[PDB]
Design a protein around this ligand. Structure first.
Ligand SMILES: *[C@@H]1O[C@H](CO)[C@@H](O)[C@H](O)[C@H]1O
Ligand SMILES: C[C@@H]1O[C@@H](O)C[C@](C)(N)[C@@H]1O
Ligand SMILES: [Cl-]
Lengths: 168, 7
């Protein structure tokens, strides 16, 4: 398991424009296109992102390319942010992935706003951090995914992302 | 699923 596999599990893969959990046009492995209610606006954003006239559909390789860019964007957002960077640097590799996951979902500014959770993570007060992280619109709106990310912070293991068949 | 493995 690693951050790419973790997010692939959490986001899925769809090759045609779809709406995310908030109703926003998205494609691929959770690539947000626009918050505009206009499908034409989303299609424009898609064509710009891919570099061709896609008519709302992409290939798996194209989806993976946007995904790789989006994971980089999350990592860069953490590394440039005065609140996120020290927390990230203080964490082990597994918990670093959990933080990247949150930033991928909610953005740099969004996660930097979790002030009390971030402090508990820096303090390595894992059960307390996990309790605090769940007191959030994030948790209430996407509880299964938030539970997996929170378990990863609580335990520093990949257990929430394992299954009996070892894939599927 | 819909993905593969193995983990
Ligand atoms: C594992 O995945 C392969 C590849 O599609 C499939 O052929 C098998 O049925 C499955 O066990
Ligand atoms: C995808 C299907 O389920 C799984 C096994 C398989 C052979 N890949 C099959 O084609
Ligand atoms: Cl969820």
């Amino acid at each position: 398991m690693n951050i790419f596999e973790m997010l692939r599990i959490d986001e899925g893969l769809r090759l045609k424009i779809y709406k995310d959990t908030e109703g926003y046009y998205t494609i691929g492995i959770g690539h947000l296109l626009t918050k505009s209610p206009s499908l034409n606006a989303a299609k424009s954003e898609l064509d710009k992102a891919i570099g061709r006239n896609t008519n709302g559909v992409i290939t798996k390789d194209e989806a993976e390319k946007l995904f790789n860019q989006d994971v980089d964007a999350a990592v860069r957002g953490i590394l440039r942010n005065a609140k996120l960077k020290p927390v990230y640097d203080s964490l082990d590799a597994v918990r670093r992935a959990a933080l990247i996951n949150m930033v991928f979902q909610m953005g740099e500014t969004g996660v930097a706003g979790f002030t009390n959770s971030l402090r508990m993570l820096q303090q390595k007060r894992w059960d307390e951090a996990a309790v605090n992280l769940a007191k959030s619109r994030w948790y209430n709106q996407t509880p299964n995914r938030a539970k997996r990310v929170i378990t990863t912070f609580r335990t520093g293991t990949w257990d929430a992302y394992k299954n009996a068949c070892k894939x599927x | 699923x819909x993905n593969x493995x193995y983990x």
